[PDB]
Design a protein around this ligand. Structure first.
Ligand SMILES: C[C@H](c1cccc2ccccc12)N1CCC(C(=O)NCc2ccc3c(c2)OCO3)CC1
Ligand SMILES: [Zn+2]
Length: 312
């Protein structure tokens, strides 16, 4: 005999569907899931009904629901999200220094840092999936948020990941609509040029870890065979993230918002988060340690911001 179940892609909109006892969900819906669990080819358990299944957007209304919720047109997204969620729901999200963190697992240290950094920045997401999952993550329930970050950045559970690259995909879905940056490049020979940067690039900079240094000038190669100076004339955003490859860099109190460091090599290494509180907290998944100063291989540093305009 048949039965009635519900299908969804966003978990908010449900669609009543007659489930023929004969087939496997896959024959009837396509790829299908339960709580992350893949069940594409299986038979409907006699007490299966009244349960909500995920499915691939196999028609207009579904495709439309996914885009609205996820803000993606990638036909594989929903299936990758589910694979990840399937595993992230096995992770532990303890409070460490008054933030949600991640107990080490499956090379997820980088996601930990992303997650700890986000919680300290006033940033909002456009995609309802991100908004909601983030709201739930700040509240200690971060399985969905991780699975989504993984899916947005095209990574799978187990792989080691780069915090910066990951920020790049995420900040693509953050409200940076008002975020503006103006940079001036002066070459003593070539002359001057000025650039306005919007979106992700208004907030993210690869070249120095120091925010002061971008204000005072950083040297860069000039097509002229010389060394140019790049400095910030104007900043409009609630934060900035500064990145460099791992080098020995000193973190003092009162100078930054938060940071992470990477120890190891490109192929194989470990991230830890540092946050500046009453004193410095170094958050390493579940583990916590304090110090008044840290000098190590910092890779990404965050600073708070409102509006900045240069003298000069
Ligand atoms: C911050 C740091 C870094 C950022 C920028 C410059 C750096 C330079 C040196 C060391 C770290 C640096 N780091 C680089 C890549 C790393 C990563 O995701 N690696 C994945 C991976 C997995 C298996 C591999 C492999 C790479 O290559 C071989 O097999 C994470 C972040
Ligand atoms: Zn030049």
């Amino acid at each position: 005999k048949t039965i009635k179940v519900f299908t969804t892609v966003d978990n908010t909109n449900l669609h009543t569907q007659l489930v023929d006892m004969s087939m496997t969900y896959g024959q009837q819906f396509g790829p299908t899931y339960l709580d992350g669990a893949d069940v594409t080819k299986i038979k409907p358990h006699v007490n299966h009904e009244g349960k909500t299944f995920f499915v691939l957007p196999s028609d207009d209304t579904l495709r439309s629901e996914a885009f609205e919720y996820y803000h993606t047109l990638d036909e594989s997204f929903l299936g990758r999200y589910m694979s990840a969620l399937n595993h992230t729901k096995k992770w532990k999200f303890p409070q460490v220094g008054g933030l949600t963190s991640i107990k080490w697992a499956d090379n997820n240290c980088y996601l930990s840092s992303v997650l700890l950094a986000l919680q300290q920045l006033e940033v909002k997401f456009n995609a309802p999936a991100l908004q909601e999952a983030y709201y739930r993550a700040r509240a200690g329930d971060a399985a969905n948020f991780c699975a989504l970050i993984l899916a947005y950045s095209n990574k799978t559970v187990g792989e080691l990941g780069d915090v910066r690259e990951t920020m790049t995909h995420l900040l693509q879905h953050a409200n940076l609509e008002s975020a503006k940056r103006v940079l001036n490049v002066v070459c003593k020979h070539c002359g001057q040029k000025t650039t306005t940067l919007t979106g992700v690039e208004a907030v993210m900079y690869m070249g120095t870890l120091s925010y002061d240094n971008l204000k005072t000038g950083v040297s860069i190669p000039c097509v002229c065979g010389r060394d140019a100076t790049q400095y910030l004339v104007q900043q409009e955003s609630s934060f900035v993230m500064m990145s460099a490859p791992p080098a020995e860099y000193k973190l003092q109190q009162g100078t930054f918002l938060c940071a992470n460091e990477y120890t190891g090599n490109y192929q194989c290494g470990h991230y830890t988060h540092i946050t500046a509180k009453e004193t410095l907290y170094r958050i390493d998944g579940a583990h916590l340690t304090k110090m008044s100063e840290y000098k190590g291989p910092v890779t990404d540093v965050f600073y708070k911001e409102t509006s900045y305009t240069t003298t000069i």
